[PDB]
Design a binder for these strands. Sequence first.
RNA 1: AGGUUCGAAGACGAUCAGAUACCGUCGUAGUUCCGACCAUAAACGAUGCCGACCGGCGAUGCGGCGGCGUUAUUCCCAUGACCCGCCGGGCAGCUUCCGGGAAACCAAAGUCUUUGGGUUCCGGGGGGAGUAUGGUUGCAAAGCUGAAACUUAAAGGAAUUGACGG
Lengths: 221, 71, 102, 83, 83, 220, 135, 129, 24
Amino acid sequence: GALDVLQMKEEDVLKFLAAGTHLGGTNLDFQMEQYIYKRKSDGIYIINLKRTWEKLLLAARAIVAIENPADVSVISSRNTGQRAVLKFAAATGATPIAGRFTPGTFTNQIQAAFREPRLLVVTDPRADHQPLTEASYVNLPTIALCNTDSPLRYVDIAIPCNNKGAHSVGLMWWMLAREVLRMRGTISREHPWEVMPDLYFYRDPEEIEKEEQAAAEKAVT
Amino acid sequence: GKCRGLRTARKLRSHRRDQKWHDKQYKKAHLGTALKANPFGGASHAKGIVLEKVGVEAKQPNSAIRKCVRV
Amino acid sequence: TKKRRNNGRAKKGRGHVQPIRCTNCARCVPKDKAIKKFVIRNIVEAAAVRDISEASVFDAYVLPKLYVKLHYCVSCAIHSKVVRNRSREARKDRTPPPRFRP
Amino acid sequence: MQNDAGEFVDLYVPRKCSASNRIIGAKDHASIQMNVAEVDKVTGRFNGQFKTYAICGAIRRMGESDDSILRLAKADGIVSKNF
Amino acid sequence: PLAKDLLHPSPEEEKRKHKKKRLVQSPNSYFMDVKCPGCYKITTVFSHAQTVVLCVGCSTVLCQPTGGKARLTEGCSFRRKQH
Amino acid sequence: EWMPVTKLGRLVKDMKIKSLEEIYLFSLPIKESEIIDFFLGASLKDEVLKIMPVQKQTRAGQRTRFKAFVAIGDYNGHVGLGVKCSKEVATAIRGAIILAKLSIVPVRRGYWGNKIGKPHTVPCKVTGRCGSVLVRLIPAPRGTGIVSAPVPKKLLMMAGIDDCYTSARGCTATLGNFAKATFDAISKTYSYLTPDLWKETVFTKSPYQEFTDHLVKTHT
Amino acid sequence: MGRVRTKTVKKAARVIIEKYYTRLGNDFHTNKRVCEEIAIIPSKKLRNKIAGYVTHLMKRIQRGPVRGISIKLQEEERERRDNYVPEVSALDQEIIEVDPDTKEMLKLLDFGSLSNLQVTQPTVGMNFKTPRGPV
Amino acid sequence: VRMNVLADALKSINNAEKRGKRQVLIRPCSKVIVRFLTVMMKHGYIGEFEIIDDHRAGKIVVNLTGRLNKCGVISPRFDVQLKDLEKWQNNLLPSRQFGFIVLTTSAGIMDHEEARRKHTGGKILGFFF
Amino acid sequence: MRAKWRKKRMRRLKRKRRKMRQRS
RNA sequence: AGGUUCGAAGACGAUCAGAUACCGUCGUAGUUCCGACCAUAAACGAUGCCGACCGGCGAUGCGGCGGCGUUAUUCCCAUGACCCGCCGGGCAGCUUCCGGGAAACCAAAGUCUUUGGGUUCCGGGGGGAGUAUGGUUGCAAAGCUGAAACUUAAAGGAAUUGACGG
Ligand SMILES: [Mg+2]
Ligand SMILES: [Mg+2]
Ligand SMILES: [Mg+2]
Ligand SMILES: [Mg+2]
Ligand SMILES: [Mg+2]
Ligand SMILES: [Zn+2]
């Protein structure tokens, strides 16, 4: 997005820095090299957040270009991102796939699990190589949330933010949902979106098993 | 690889006429020892006198007496 | 068919590697081809460590080790089961088997 | 096509990849044709009309699909010049 | 990347490339003004000098040849020639 | 009595896609044979190239499955070759017909020279490769016919090619490879870029986005 | 030994558990008394084998979320997923520990000089990477 | 050693075209290479090319338009007459509707169609289609 | 036979043949 | 000259149906050194040399260049030892729908019917046969060059399934 209204805001910068999403891995992929600002003394690559914003806006345009909101499918095989893709599907009307992706979903037309979408959106290429590979049999364009070391074999709209941190993954999914809903006539671009980005964060079972009881003690006291 | 120069024709033709001796048909047709060994001497037919009548056993899978004449 | 890319040996930029004798059968094996096992074993059995320590004249006496480097031809290695045949895909990894510390 | 008389004697005109300028075959199922939705100038909202790009299986198998799409968006004006 | 700009590589990679593999060959060596302490005259010395360079007004050495670059003696000053 | 399970199949069935070239343009895979015969009905000629009895050794002797090579296609520029291995010959024939139906590719016809009427020969010399079999199709002037071995001859003929020189190398006795190489050579007639295809392409809507509203109503 | 249940009994148990979770209990005899009307079992031995596996699976269900679907378990999971957004966001820190390299990136991005950024002292040593090979 | 600078340049262009690069750099430039590339550029198979001038033999950077199939070379520069130009043409070209054979004639470096237009033979250089 | 032992047998036979011819 | 060990030949003891062997004991030539021959090896990467181009990655060896820091002496820089990079020439490795291949596999065994960078050697179904004969080299053993008659419908390569494995 080249427009002035389609520009990163200070609040967006603050969310990005708080969630990380600029601290890549110690490895660098030669096709991801163009999104890197500099390598720290830690060996951690710094990802250009402006380039990430532009790629995210391009992905949002690609997603909103589809008339049928169910024709875009969001997949996260890893646990850190299943909640994010479910909330993304709930927000945008997309079709979610979480956890184990059964092979042949896009190619074997016999079973009821078969589906043929018009766009693929992937949390991580290494974790979701199987849907990435299967999209190559059915003429399926792909957006994937790639890190500095993510292979880009079947990736078209690679967003260079992160794929490791739970906060980063939740934030990037929430940001993409916010952008597609603002591009459509859903949000007014003026007031902040009412959905907190914590709604998209993956929580570890040792937090699910203690947070609500801590809150229950605080509420009863 | 093979040479491709503009004045390599001598080596090309020398190599062709050297390598032409390595297939059985050319060696047979141009050495002449096959012609010497051939009883007909390069003739399609020949005449002879029947020396004897013999029977020749067939090969291993077959079993018959092929009737031949020693001529 | 070429079974192994490295021809079953580590010789890469050499012409000749000096041979060694198999510790089991005294066969001349190229040094880079032989299977090497560096065994670092307690000089007494773990069944007898207590008896030795009780009979020791010393109090804090640490039992010495026994450092032996063993070279095997592949025949003696396979017969002694230090190495085993592997599948076509499994031949390609070089990571040594885990030590099993627990 | 287009014999001396003039008519186009060819039953279809195949698409060409917008990056490598290669013909996209009928049985090349790895090829993609995506639409990027450009928005209005003032509100940043989708105005219905979009722009289309096509990438062939060879390019988006050797992995240069991301760079190709980014270059096309940059050149046509979707992505800002200061990317 | 399929659309690398070969005509205009940035000076970073232009410098990091080998001297011959650059777009136009560029020597990595230079000439330096060398100032021996206790002397007024200025000596022009090759950076990769293979010979022991001596002052003419004093029997003192200015550089010692090494593998790649002549090592100037301690206490001697030096500046570049025309960058 | 055909119940399609595919967006493409549904759109074909309910008169939304008019020509097979609309599918060929966007390279959509044909995943059910009842799609093409709706278009090329009553014109898809068929032929059984060979029935080869492959065998697999078992504990109790060896068991035999029959492999059927089937070439189909109207004599106007569409051709397809299918190979199916099945226990019974008739079942293998039906499966090979279905696979040949699925693998139907368009054929580009050109002129040997002096482009006058309907194109009759291959636009340029093309090479198909399968196994060790290499097959080269060379353009030929009007009336030469197909000079070739019989197995590629029938495939070229039902591909709509009128005149063509053919050259083959390799173990052409392998009929499956020899047919598949010619099928590859025929199929890459559009894979070849020629200066008359140099015009910059104009993109039309894919059938999916063009009829995405009808698919919601019908193919839920 | 030799008491492993099969697909027939296991699938029947899972189906009737996910269809009649409310009525079933942890008592084998009650669970074998509900089967004659909630299902048609051709054999008494099959019926009571299924009932025993139902008791086992329901003990496992009350101790934890077995893969058998359950309406109460799913509504609890849905509550625990699409709710419990904290009253304060996890991404609105008062200060953010920021690297000088990232500060330079923000300066080039034109988002430099933000009051919520505290520039960390860069680490010294460049001692990342694991030691190569064993030892 | 390098004995055919035009062969090296044509192979470099062919490999870059197959790999899909947008620009190719050919290291030893020459008048023959510039004339060959000018023929290709006039027939539209390549874009503009720019000559980097070092005081040695220069280099060339060619913009590839992606519409090139093969730009090989005939290494022994055979003497081609107008009588056997047709045999060369139907031995080396994919078809009669397109493809060009560049041969150096006494009138310069040009394709076979111009050579036959102005009625002259010459030495074979290469082909492109 | 092993090819090496056929080679050895041929060498023995050739020495015997050379000895026989030299005897003339 | 020297000969400790090992050890062709040889002797004996075992084993075995036999056992001129495998196993054991001894042991000649040899194995060691100097000088002179021989010129053959699965002398192998079963893979000619020179040159260009065509992916990624992490290492390693040498040389050079540039950088936070740690360490050695000293008062500091140099210089060594680590650490992070870049370049060139190597030995290689992992990965890749570059591409090739009958495949195994190969970043060369790719840039090959879209066939031409230069050049050397060399193969033409299996045997007979690397044989006979002639020539030539050698003290010898043998090396190099090297047929034919005749015989044969296969011999081979790579993979798959099965059967079998002391
Ligand atoms: Mg073997
Ligand atoms: Mg050797
Ligand atoms: Mg002894
Ligand atoms: Mg050469
Ligand atoms: Mg022979
Ligand atoms: Zn041994």
